[PDB]
Amino acid sequence: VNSFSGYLKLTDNVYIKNADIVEEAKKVKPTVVVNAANVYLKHGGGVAGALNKATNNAMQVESDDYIATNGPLKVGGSCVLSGHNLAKHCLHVVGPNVNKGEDIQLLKSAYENFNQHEVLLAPLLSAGIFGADPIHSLRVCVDTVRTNVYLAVFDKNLYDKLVSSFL
Numbered sequence: 001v002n003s004f005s006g007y008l009k010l011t012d013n014v015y016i017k018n019a020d021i022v023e024e025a026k027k028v029k030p031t032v033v034v035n036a037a038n039v040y041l042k043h044g045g046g047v048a049g050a051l052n053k054a055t056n057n058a059m060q061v062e063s064d065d066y067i068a069t070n071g072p073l074k075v076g077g078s079c080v081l082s083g084h085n086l087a088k089h090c091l092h093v094v095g096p097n098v099n100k101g102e103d104i105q106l107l108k109s110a111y112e113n114f115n116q117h118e119v120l121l122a123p124l125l126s127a128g129i130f131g132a133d134p135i136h137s138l139r140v141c142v143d144t145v146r147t148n149v150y151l152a153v154f155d156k157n158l159y160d161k162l163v164s165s166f167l
């Protein structure tokens with residue numbers, strides 16, 4: 001039993017809700033919140049910009065030190081950093097950005113990072129400003145993640161389409 005509330009159950013381990021991941025994280029304070037990161041951990045917009053804003057830019061300051069030490073992430077890769085005031089940890093995961101010409105096949109690799117954590121609050125990877133089809137992202141999530149994932153879909157209209165079209 002966990003403290004996630006109001007989610008629709010899609011499979012044994014995947015759940016979904018129309019919610020703002022920032023507000024969800026503040027309420028639940030989950031062990032792991034997933035950020036929709038880029039390889040430079042530059043949290044400018046989308047989920048990343050919103051999560052960073054909620055940390056009063058502390059996520060960005062920590063991220064800049066991470067990059068200065070380690071260099072950029074790989075597309076499909078991840079790193080674990082602090083969750084600041086939002087969660088214990090933030091798993092920064094880089095899905096492919098179609099608006100940069102990146103290989104959508106890397107979306108499965110991106111979701112594989114979730115399997116290193118027993119329970120996660122997460123957005124749909126490569127959705128939103130990353131330009132991939134969210135119906136596809138949800139399908140890859142369900143077919144790749146085996147740990148317990150609670151998906152927050154910010155847009156109410158898109159949420160209804162994902163549910164009604166879910167196979």
Ligand SMILES: OC[C@@H](COCc1ccccc1)Nc1ncnc2[nH]ccc12
Pocket residue numbers: 019020021022036046047050123124125126127128129134152153154155158
């Ligand atoms: O795939 C993740 C994207 C999808 O939403 C954007 C969108 C706009 C119009 C139509 C479809 C989709 N972003 C988020 N998801 C959850 N919580 C969030 N908080 C702030 C951003 C954000």
Ligand SMILES: [Cl-]
Pocket residue numbers: 045046047127128129130
């Ligand atoms: Cl977005």
